[PDB]
RNA sequence: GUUACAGACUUAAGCAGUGGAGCAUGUUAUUUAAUUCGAUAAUCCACGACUAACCUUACCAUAUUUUGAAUAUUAUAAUAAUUAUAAUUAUUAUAUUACAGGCGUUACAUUGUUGUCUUUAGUUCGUGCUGCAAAGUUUUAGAUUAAGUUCAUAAACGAACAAAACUCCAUAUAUAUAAUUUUAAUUAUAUAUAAUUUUAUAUUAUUUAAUAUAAAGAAAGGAAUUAAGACAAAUCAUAAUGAUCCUUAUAAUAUGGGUAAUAGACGUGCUAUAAUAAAAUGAUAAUAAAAUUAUAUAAAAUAUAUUUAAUUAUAUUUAAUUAAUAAUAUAAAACAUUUUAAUUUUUAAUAUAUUUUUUUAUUAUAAAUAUGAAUUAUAAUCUGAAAUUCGAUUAUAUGAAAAAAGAAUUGCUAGUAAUACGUAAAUUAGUAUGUUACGGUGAAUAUUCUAACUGUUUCGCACUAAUCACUCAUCACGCGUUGAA
């Protein structure tokens, strides 16, 4: 849910256990909005191929998790 | 569609007297038999 | 209602196949008399199908 | 499991069966089954007046609903073939397949567009 | 024989087209049985004056 | 890599474009875990695909299914319907093999279908006749037509698939029907009739045929149809089938990612580069058509953006109608007033006056804008369960390039092109710069020279799976034979 009313996007996670004991949260959500309730929790967000380790700072609070796991590789040209 | 529609199976149920022939099925069976004969039959399925 | 009409024409098409299947008989695995049939024509009056 | 592809035992549609068709049909059936419930959950979620905790719970429930409850997941296949491109709704058929049927006279009132 | 109709050529009766592409008098059809070698079919087309 | 003519959007005029700019979209290449697969000269490149968020999808990562979607065979058991506590059947369950399944590979195995030659005029068959015959004539002297199309002449006379015609749209007229509140009778729709127009006077060439004139008529288009053969043209990804390969995997399900990656390149489009052209406004609402609305169309009106209100965009809530009745929807260009930088080709202070929405005088007013809308920042809204990769709006800012475009190149002869003229639907939950359709306003030009490409034709032909034809010699590899010595 983008629109301010109805928001924000929420997904079920193993949050409380992570908060108690530093066990990273392997998310395959990528469309869950980051919340104030998880800043300083270690997330392992899916990238299509491999799960990506991220520590959620206070600057990330508005954004989605998938925004920090870049799916495509950085393009180059083989100059032949 | 309507999943309960008459099939060839039923055309034996409704009219046992008439020995019907499903042609496509028969053809398939003949093909299978031919495959078996010439060593191109399906391999036996694993169970485990 | 065009949905209903579509459903009816589907049914008709399915019945045609069934009829085709029926048309071929067997006689104790001796003779297989294949009765040829035309494509069916389905007449949908308000009262009755024919 | 082994005995069926999907959780619920649904019937096969008559005539042309295909894997994709099978998948779609089942999905449609599940949508039909759980249509009212989904609507109710949506209503509970998108409510300014109701308690917020309840709306959150409803939203969570909606999120947790499976692939086969989703209306958006349904895709209109061809019924004669199993194609899913240029599928005309007025005769649930693919473009080429529709044309083939039309020229034969299978369609109830369709004919060549001469002007 | 022939596939033109001469009843329409010199009289008040006009030809009409079935599904706007088959002259009424014509009737075309095919049926495709599978062989040992593969698929084949058999077009038939009659005229009927 | 030949001869001769004839043809048309072929060329020539003409009108508008492409090629430069930015964006869109397809393709290429390269990248990538995957960028699914095909189309790739004319006859690919908004093509298959009339909408890639998930799905669709076929691709990839990680998980997990193994008789699975079917049909049949063989057994145990359970429930329900029917009969008069038993039985008959139908199903389900657990298994049991044959298998099922495969968008895996080959349209150089096929089907069907399609593209191009092609609305081009060719393609053949009888009986007769000619030639020992394969064959030829018919199927063409010469002309003509859009045309194996009629003339004519001819050992021919007929006949077929093509051409034409019947067909559809549109037109004119007549009849019927519609209690002229479903009204638009200025209509709609069934049935006819109508033209491939007719007649006559003359002027050129030989009874006719082109020009002109006249009188009679509403009489003038578009669509579908694209033969035989060929291109081993396209499709095994609409679908089906042959052969072949996979069967705990090349079959099946879920979660995410990808198909949207970006050096250069190539098509198609869209928007532009301002005054024979852009913007504000226009409620006794200037003027259309065609089509959609029970997987809906959404009117009026309230609220917010926004001090009036209108406009535009959302929200609120559903009036009406599943439709000649209501809604989508007051069509838009047009036409009219106003404004418009480049432009000291204007403004504003004074006077000035029979140009007063204005004039004159004297003072001051000193290469991208008040063009364009790419790119980006923030805030909202919409659809959906979900908008990060990856959707659509609105607002406040941001305001690149671009100064009518090199060689070259595309479409179009009339209701056509053109149009800063708008309208609709198909595909959607949601998004069209695409597609398919509708009307509105409406032109300019014109045939003689040459390239090509279709017809038919001249001459040639050692080709006949027919020029991707056939074919010549050395050199290289083996096995003979016969010379020289
Ligand atoms: Mg869908
Ligand atoms: Mg030109
Ligand atoms: Mg360029
Ligand atoms: Mg350009
Ligand atoms: Mg591709
Ligand atoms: Mg190919
Ligand atoms: Mg195109
Ligand atoms: Mg998926
Ligand atoms: Mg696969
Ligand atoms: Mg098989
Ligand atoms: Mg073919
Ligand atoms: Mg000839
Ligand atoms: Mg001949
Ligand atoms: Mg009236
Ligand atoms: Mg014709
Ligand atoms: Mg042909
Ligand atoms: Mg081929
Ligand atoms: Mg080929
Ligand atoms: Mg095959
Ligand atoms: Mg393939
Ligand atoms: Mg298939
Ligand atoms: Mg698999
Ligand atoms: Mg693409
Ligand atoms: Mg301008
Ligand atoms: Mg108006
Ligand atoms: Mg309104
Ligand atoms: Mg109305
Ligand atoms: Mg501007
Ligand atoms: Mg510049
Ligand atoms: Mg503009
Ligand atoms: Mg127009
Ligand atoms: Mg010719």
Give SS3 for D36.
Answer: helix
Q: How far apart are the two ends of chain E, measured CA to CA in Å?
A: 10
Distance CA(D34)–CA(D28), nearest Å, equals 10
| Structure-token pair, residue C5 | 């009409």
- Residue D37 maps to a domain: yes
CB distance from D62 to chain E under 8 Å? no
Angstrom CA distances, B6 to B23, C35, C38, D15, E23, stand at: 16, 20, 20, 11, 36
Do chains E and A touch by CB distance (3+ pairs < 8 Å)?
A: no
E1: Cβ contacts below 8 Å, ≥ 6 apart: E47
| Structure-token pair, residue D31 | 């949508």
| Structure-token pair, residue D8 | 């619920």
Resolution value in angstroms: 3.2
Residue numbers 15-34 of B with CB closer than 7 A to any atom of strand F: 25, 28, 31-32, 34
Q: Residues B27, B29, B34, B40: is their CA dihedral positive or negative?
A: positive
Name residues with Cβ closer than 5 Å to ligand 1, which is an ion.
D 75
Distance CA(D56)–CA(D86), nearest Å, equals 40
E30: Cβ contacts below 8 Å, ≥ 6 apart: E41, E42, E43, E44
Domain that holds residue D66: 19-104
Number of structural domains found in chain D: 1
CB distance from B11 to chain C under 8 Å? yes
Burial of residue A35, with CB atoms counted within 10 A of its CB: 0-12 exposed, 13-18 middle, 19 or more buried: middle
E26 contacts E16 by C-beta, under 8 angstroms: no
D18: Cβ contacts below 8 Å, ≥ 6 apart: D77, D82
| Residues in chain D closer than 8 A to B5 (CB atoms) | 14
> Which nucleotide is closest to B33, CA to C1'?
F98
| Structure-token pair, residue A53 | 């380790």
Question: Which residue has 């060549």 as its token pair?
Answer: D112
| Residues in chain D closer than 8 A to E20 (CB atoms) | 111-114
Angstrom CA distances, C33 to B22, B48, C23, D65, stand at: 13, 47, 9, 55
Measured at the alpha carbon of residue A15, what is the angle toward residues A12 and A16, in degrees to the nearest 5?
A: 125
Stated as kind and residue range, the H or E segment containing C25 is: strand C25-26
Question: Which residue has 């959950």 as its token pair?
Answer: D41
- Residue D87 maps to a domain: yes
Stated as kind and residue range, the H or E segment containing E30 is: none
- Residue-level length of chain E: 49
CB distance from C10 to chain D under 8 Å? yes
D112 contacts E19 by C-beta, under 8 angstroms: yes
Distance CA(C38)–CA(E44), nearest Å, equals 13
| Structure-token pair, residue A3 | 């629109």
- Residue D48 maps to a domain: yes
Distance CA(D97)–CA(D77), nearest Å, equals 12
- Residue D70 maps to a domain: yes
C11 contacts B2 by C-beta, under 8 angstroms: yes
| Structure-token pair, residue D74 | 């349904």
Q: Which residue of C has its CA nearest to D14?
A: C14
A37 contacts A16 by C-beta, under 8 angstroms: no
- Residue D57 maps to a domain: yes
Distance CA(D79)–CA(D106), nearest Å, equals 14
Torsions phi, psi of A28, nearest 5? Answer: -115, 25
- Residue D47 maps to a domain: yes
Distance CA(D81)–CA(D14), nearest Å, equals 12
Distance CA(D39)–CA(E25), nearest Å, equals 57
Instruction: Please state how this structure was obtained.
Output: cryo-EM
Distance CA(D39)–CA(D52), nearest Å, equals 18
Distance CA(B31)–CA(D24), nearest Å, equals 31
| Structure-token pair, residue D9 | 């035992």
Distance CA(D56)–CA(A12), nearest Å, equals 11
> Which nucleotide is closest to B22, CA to C1'?
F71
Q: Alpha helix locations (H) across D34-105?
A: 36-45, 52-64, 95-104
Question: Which residue has 């949908």 as its token pair?
Answer: C44
C19 contacts B10 by C-beta, under 8 angstroms: no
- Residue D100 maps to a domain: yes
| Structure-token pair, residue D24 | 């779609």
| Residues in chain E closer than 8 A to D105 (CB atoms) | 18-19
Closest CA to A53 of A18, A21, A26: A26
Q: Is the CB of D13 under 7 A from strand F?
A: no
Measured at the alpha carbon of residue E34, what is the angle toward residues E29 and E40, in degrees to the nearest 5?
A: 50
Torsions phi, psi of D81, nearest 5? Answer: -95, -165
Residue D25 CA, nucleotide F295 C1', distance (Å)? 15
- Residue D7 maps to a domain: no
CATH number, residue D31: 1.10.287.1480
Three-state SS sequence of chain A: CCCCCCCCCCCCCCHHHHHHCCCCECCCCCCCECCHHHCCCEEEECCCCCCEEEECCHHHCCCECHHHCCCCCCCCCCCC
Angstrom CA distances, E49 to A1, A25, B21, E22, stand at: 70, 82, 38, 14
Torsions phi, psi of E44, nearest 5? Answer: -130, 145
Q: Which residue of D has its CA nearest to E27?
A: D104
Half-sphere exposure of B11 (CA within 13 A, CB side): 13
Q: How far is D15 from chain B (nearest CA, A)?
A: 8
Residue numbers 1-49 of E with CB closer than 7 A to any atom of strand F: 2-4, 8-9, 12, 14-17, 20-21, 23, 30, 32, 34, 36-41, 43
DSSP letter, residue C39: P
């Amino acid at each position: 849910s983008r629109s301010v009313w109805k928001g924000p996007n929420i997904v079920p996670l193993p949050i409380r256990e992570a908060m108690t004991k530093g066990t990273p949260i392997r998310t395959n959500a990528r469309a869950a909005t980051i919340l104030p309730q998880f800043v300083g929790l270690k997330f392992q967000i899916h990238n299509g191929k491999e799960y990506v380790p991220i520590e959620i700072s206070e600057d990330m609070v508005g954004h989605k998790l998938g925004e920090f796991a870049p799916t495509r590789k950085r393009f180059s040209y083989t100059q032949t | 569609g309507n999943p309960d529609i008459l099939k060839f199976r039923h055309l034996k149920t409704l009219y046992p007297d008439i020995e019907f022939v499903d042609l496509e099925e028969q053809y398939r069976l003949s093909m299978v038999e031919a495959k078996k004969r010439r060593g191109k039959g399906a391999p036996k399925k694993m169970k485990k | 209602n065009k949905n209903m009409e579509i459903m009816n024409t589907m049914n008709d098409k399915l019945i045609n196949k069934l009829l085709y299947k029926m048309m071929t008989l067997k006689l104790n695995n001796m003779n297989i008399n294949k009765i040829i049939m035309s494509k069916t024509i389905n007449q949908h009056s308000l009262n009755k199908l024919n | 499991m082994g005995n069926f592809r999907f959780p619920i035992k649904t019937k096969l549609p008559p005539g042309f069966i295909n894997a994709r068709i099978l998948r779609d049909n089942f999905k449609r059936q599940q949508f039909k089954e759980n249509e009212i419930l989904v609507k109710s959950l949506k209503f509970i979620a998108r409510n300014m007046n109701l308690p917020t905790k309840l709306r959150l719970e409803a939203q969570l429930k909606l999120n947790a609903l499976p692939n086969y409850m989703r209306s958006t997941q349904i895709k209109n296949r061809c019924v004669d073939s199993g194609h899913a491109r240029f599928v005309l709704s007025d005769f649930r058929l693919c473009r080429y397949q529709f044309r083939e049927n039309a020229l034969k006279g299978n369609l109830p009132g369709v004919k060549k567009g001469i002007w | 024989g022939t596939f033109n109709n001469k009843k329409y050529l010199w009289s008040n009766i006009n030809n009409n087209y079935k599904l706007n592409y088959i002259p009424s008098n014509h009737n075309l059809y095919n049926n495709s049985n599978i062989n040992k070698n593969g698929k084949y079919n058999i077009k038939v087309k009659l005229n009927f004056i």
